[PDB]
mmCIF file of all heavy atoms in Angstrom:
data_model
loop_
_atom_site.group_PDB
_atom_site.id
_atom_site.type_symbol
_atom_site.label_atom_id
_atom_site.label_comp_id
_atom_site.label_asym_id
_atom_site.label_seq_id
_atom_site.Cartn_x
_atom_site.Cartn_y
_atom_site.Cartn_z
ATOM 1 N N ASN K 399 -8.431 1.566 27.993
ATOM 2 C CA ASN K 399 -9.188 1.308 29.199
ATOM 3 C C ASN K 399 -8.742 2.326 30.237
ATOM 4 O O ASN K 399 -7.550 2.620 30.368
ATOM 5 C CB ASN K 399 -8.978 -0.147 29.619
ATOM 6 C CG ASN K 399 -9.303 -1.125 28.464
ATOM 7 O OD1 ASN K 399 -10.472 -1.322 28.119
ATOM 8 N ND2 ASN K 399 -8.269 -1.689 27.839
ATOM 9 N N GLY K 400 -9.684 2.885 30.919
ATOM 10 C CA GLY K 400 -9.531 4.126 31.637
ATOM 11 C C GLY K 400 -10.774 4.923 31.377
ATOM 12 O O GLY K 400 -11.745 4.406 30.824
ATOM 13 N N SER K 401 -10.756 6.197 31.753
ATOM 14 C CA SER K 401 -11.947 6.987 31.471
ATOM 15 C C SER K 401 -12.206 7.140 29.974
ATOM 16 O O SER K 401 -13.310 7.505 29.596
ATOM 17 C CB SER K 401 -11.857 8.382 32.108
ATOM 18 O OG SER K 401 -10.924 9.179 31.400
ATOM 19 N N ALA K 425 -10.141 -5.597 29.466
ATOM 20 C CA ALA K 425 -9.991 -4.177 29.785
ATOM 21 C C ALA K 425 -8.596 -3.886 30.342
ATOM 22 O O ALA K 425 -8.423 -3.310 31.421
ATOM 23 C CB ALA K 425 -11.090 -3.732 30.752
ATOM 24 N N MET K 427 -5.222 -1.957 30.575
ATOM 25 C CA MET K 427 -4.612 -0.681 30.226
ATOM 26 C C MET K 427 -3.458 -0.909 29.266
ATOM 27 O O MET K 427 -2.664 -1.840 29.442
ATOM 28 C CB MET K 427 -4.096 0.038 31.467
ATOM 29 C CG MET K 427 -5.153 0.695 32.305
ATOM 30 S SD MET K 427 -4.393 1.198 33.868
ATOM 31 C CE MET K 427 -3.020 2.206 33.292
ATOM 32 N N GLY K 451 -5.471 6.949 27.768
ATOM 33 C CA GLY K 451 -5.060 7.720 28.922
ATOM 34 C C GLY K 451 -3.541 7.759 29.110
ATOM 35 O O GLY K 451 -2.788 6.984 28.513
ATOM 36 N N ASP K 452 -3.100 8.689 29.971
ATOM 37 C CA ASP K 452 -1.666 8.875 30.186
ATOM 38 C C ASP K 452 -1.057 7.724 30.979
ATOM 39 O O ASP K 452 0.040 7.265 30.652
ATOM 40 C CB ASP K 452 -1.389 10.207 30.887
ATOM 41 C CG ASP K 452 -2.176 10.371 32.181
ATOM 42 O OD1 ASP K 452 -3.377 10.042 32.214
ATOM 43 O OD2 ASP K 452 -1.589 10.846 33.173
ATOM 44 N N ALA K 453 -1.757 7.214 31.999
ATOM 45 C CA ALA K 453 -1.204 6.066 32.712
ATOM 46 C C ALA K 453 -1.118 4.853 31.795
ATOM 47 O O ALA K 453 -0.131 4.107 31.833
ATOM 48 C CB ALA K 453 -2.023 5.747 33.963
ATOM 49 N N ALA K 454 -2.132 4.643 30.950
ATOM 50 C CA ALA K 454 -2.061 3.539 29.993
ATOM 51 C C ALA K 454 -0.930 3.758 28.996
ATOM 52 O O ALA K 454 -0.276 2.802 28.562
ATOM 53 C CB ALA K 454 -3.393 3.363 29.267
ATOM 54 N N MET K 457 2.263 2.637 30.268
ATOM 55 C CA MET K 457 2.452 1.196 30.339
ATOM 56 C C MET K 457 3.001 0.634 29.032
ATOM 57 O O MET K 457 3.879 -0.224 29.061
ATOM 58 C CB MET K 457 1.131 0.510 30.677
ATOM 59 C CG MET K 457 0.541 0.849 32.015
ATOM 60 S SD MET K 457 -0.585 -0.495 32.422
ATOM 61 C CE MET K 457 0.431 -1.814 31.826
ATOM 62 N N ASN K 479 -4.407 13.629 32.039
ATOM 63 C CA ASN K 479 -4.940 14.195 33.270
ATOM 64 C C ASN K 479 -4.005 13.990 34.461
ATOM 65 O O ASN K 479 -4.447 14.099 35.606
ATOM 66 C CB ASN K 479 -6.331 13.621 33.569
ATOM 67 C CG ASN K 479 -6.350 12.108 33.630
ATOM 68 O OD1 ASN K 479 -5.303 11.459 33.655
ATOM 69 N ND2 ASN K 479 -7.549 11.532 33.656
ATOM 70 N N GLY K 481 -2.447 11.294 35.811
ATOM 71 C CA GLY K 481 -2.571 10.172 36.718
ATOM 72 C C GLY K 481 -3.765 9.309 36.368
ATOM 73 O O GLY K 481 -4.224 9.295 35.225
ATOM 74 N N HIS K 482 -4.238 8.562 37.368
ATOM 75 C CA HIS K 482 -5.250 7.517 37.184
ATOM 76 C C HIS K 482 -6.625 8.099 37.497
ATOM 77 O O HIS K 482 -7.115 8.016 38.625
ATOM 78 C CB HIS K 482 -4.938 6.313 38.063
ATOM 79 C CG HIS K 482 -3.579 5.734 37.824
ATOM 80 N ND1 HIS K 482 -3.388 4.467 37.312
ATOM 81 C CD2 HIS K 482 -2.342 6.255 38.007
ATOM 82 C CE1 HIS K 482 -2.093 4.229 37.199
ATOM 83 N NE2 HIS K 482 -1.436 5.295 37.615
ATOM 84 N N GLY K 483 -7.255 8.687 36.476
ATOM 85 C CA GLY K 483 -8.532 9.356 36.633
ATOM 86 C C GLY K 483 -9.618 8.505 37.263
ATOM 87 O O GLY K 483 -10.235 8.907 38.257
ATOM 88 N N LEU K 484 -9.884 7.330 36.690
ATOM 89 C CA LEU K 484 -10.947 6.494 37.239
ATOM 90 C C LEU K 484 -10.667 6.124 38.688
ATOM 91 O O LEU K 484 -11.590 6.071 39.506
ATOM 92 C CB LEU K 484 -11.149 5.237 36.388
ATOM 93 C CG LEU K 484 -11.834 5.447 35.035
ATOM 94 C CD1 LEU K 484 -12.187 4.114 34.376
ATOM 95 C CD2 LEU K 484 -13.083 6.348 35.171
ATOM 96 N N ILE O 28 -0.079 -1.265 41.365
ATOM 97 C CA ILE O 28 -0.974 -0.324 40.697
ATOM 98 C C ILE O 28 -2.387 -0.616 41.186
ATOM 99 O O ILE O 28 -2.804 -1.780 41.215
ATOM 100 C CB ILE O 28 -0.855 -0.450 39.166
ATOM 101 C CG1 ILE O 28 0.531 0.040 38.728
ATOM 102 C CG2 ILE O 28 -1.992 0.328 38.460
ATOM 103 C CD1 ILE O 28 0.813 -0.085 37.220
ATOM 104 N N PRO O 29 -3.148 0.388 41.584
ATOM 105 C CA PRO O 29 -4.485 0.132 42.134
ATOM 106 C C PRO O 29 -5.484 -0.283 41.058
ATOM 107 O O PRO O 29 -5.232 -0.234 39.855
ATOM 108 C CB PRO O 29 -4.872 1.480 42.751
ATOM 109 C CG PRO O 29 -4.093 2.492 41.920
ATOM 110 C CD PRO O 29 -2.765 1.807 41.687
ATOM 111 N N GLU O 54 2.734 -3.111 36.258
ATOM 112 C CA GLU O 54 2.809 -4.095 37.332
ATOM 113 C C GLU O 54 4.037 -4.983 37.191
ATOM 114 O O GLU O 54 4.516 -5.542 38.186
ATOM 115 C CB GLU O 54 1.542 -4.954 37.364
ATOM 116 C CG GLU O 54 0.312 -4.208 37.869
ATOM 117 C CD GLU O 54 -0.458 -3.520 36.733
ATOM 118 O OE1 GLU O 54 0.092 -3.420 35.605
ATOM 119 O OE2 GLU O 54 -1.609 -3.080 36.977
ATOM 120 N N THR O 77 -4.337 -5.539 40.530
ATOM 121 C CA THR O 77 -5.779 -5.723 40.474
ATOM 122 C C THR O 77 -6.138 -6.989 39.682
ATOM 123 O O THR O 77 -5.275 -7.720 39.193
ATOM 124 C CB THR O 77 -6.452 -4.488 39.883
ATOM 125 O OG1 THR O 77 -7.862 -4.615 40.045
ATOM 126 C CG2 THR O 77 -6.120 -4.339 38.404
ATOM 127 N N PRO O 80 -5.873 -8.277 34.099
ATOM 128 C CA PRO O 80 -4.636 -7.857 33.426
ATOM 129 C C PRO O 80 -3.657 -7.185 34.359
ATOM 130 O O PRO O 80 -2.459 -7.144 34.042
ATOM 131 C CB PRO O 80 -5.130 -6.871 32.360
ATOM 132 C CG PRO O 80 -6.309 -6.219 33.047
ATOM 133 C CD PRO O 80 -6.986 -7.345 33.840
ATOM 134 N N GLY O 81 -4.121 -6.620 35.477
ATOM 135 C CA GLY O 81 -3.174 -6.152 36.476
ATOM 136 C C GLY O 81 -2.248 -7.271 36.923
ATOM 137 O O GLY O 81 -1.022 -7.143 36.883
ATOM 138 N N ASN O 84 0.044 -8.767 34.216
ATOM 139 C CA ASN O 84 1.165 -7.882 33.916
ATOM 140 C C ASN O 84 2.343 -8.130 34.855
ATOM 141 O O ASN O 84 3.493 -7.896 34.477
ATOM 142 C CB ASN O 84 0.716 -6.416 34.002
ATOM 143 C CG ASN O 84 0.330 -5.823 32.643
ATOM 144 O OD1 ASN O 84 0.271 -6.522 31.635
ATOM 145 N ND2 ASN O 84 0.072 -4.507 32.622
ATOM 146 N N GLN O 117 -13.309 -8.255 34.438
ATOM 147 C CA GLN O 117 -11.981 -8.832 34.666
ATOM 148 C C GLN O 117 -12.073 -10.069 35.560
ATOM 149 O O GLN O 117 -11.229 -10.292 36.440
ATOM 150 C CB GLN O 117 -11.009 -7.794 35.264
ATOM 151 C CG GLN O 117 -10.663 -6.643 34.325
ATOM 152 C CD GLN O 117 -9.839 -5.539 34.998
ATOM 153 O OE1 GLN O 117 -9.787 -5.432 36.227
ATOM 154 N NE2 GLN O 117 -9.181 -4.723 34.182
HETATM 155 C C1 TPP L 603 -2.992 -3.427 33.537
HETATM 156 C C2 TPP L 603 -4.056 -2.776 34.357
HETATM 157 N N1 TPP L 603 -3.721 -2.369 35.599
HETATM 158 C C3 TPP L 603 -4.692 -1.776 36.303
HETATM 159 C C4 TPP L 603 -5.966 -1.554 35.832
HETATM 160 C C5 TPP L 603 -7.009 -0.863 36.669
HETATM 161 N N2 TPP L 603 -7.386 0.478 36.137
HETATM 162 C C6 TPP L 603 -8.528 0.729 35.507
HETATM 163 S S1 TPP L 603 -8.675 2.335 35.025
HETATM 164 C C7 TPP L 603 -7.127 2.708 35.688
HETATM 165 C C8 TPP L 603 -6.573 4.095 35.530
HETATM 166 C C9 TPP L 603 -6.201 4.371 34.092
HETATM 167 O O1 TPP L 603 -5.522 5.642 33.988
HETATM 168 P P1 TPP L 603 -5.298 6.393 32.625
HETATM 169 O O2 TPP L 603 -4.902 5.370 31.542
HETATM 170 O O3 TPP L 603 -4.411 7.557 32.842
HETATM 171 O O4 TPP L 603 -6.758 6.880 32.358
HETATM 172 P P2 TPP L 603 -7.776 7.950 32.943
HETATM 173 O O5 TPP L 603 -8.833 7.139 33.658
HETATM 174 O O6 TPP L 603 -7.051 8.882 33.858
HETATM 175 O O7 TPP L 603 -8.349 8.627 31.691
HETATM 176 C C10 TPP L 603 -6.548 1.592 36.251
HETATM 177 C C11 TPP L 603 -5.223 1.484 36.929
HETATM 178 C C12 TPP L 603 -6.220 -2.038 34.513
HETATM 179 N N3 TPP L 603 -7.416 -1.925 33.941
HETATM 180 N N4 TPP L 603 -5.254 -2.632 33.791
#
Side-chain angles (χ1 to χ4, degrees):
Chain K
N399 306 288
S401 73
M427 283 169 55
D452 54 317
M457 297 201 40
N479 55 11
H482 303 245
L484 287 189
Chain O
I28 292 178
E54 288 90 347
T77 189
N84 264 7
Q117 293 173 342

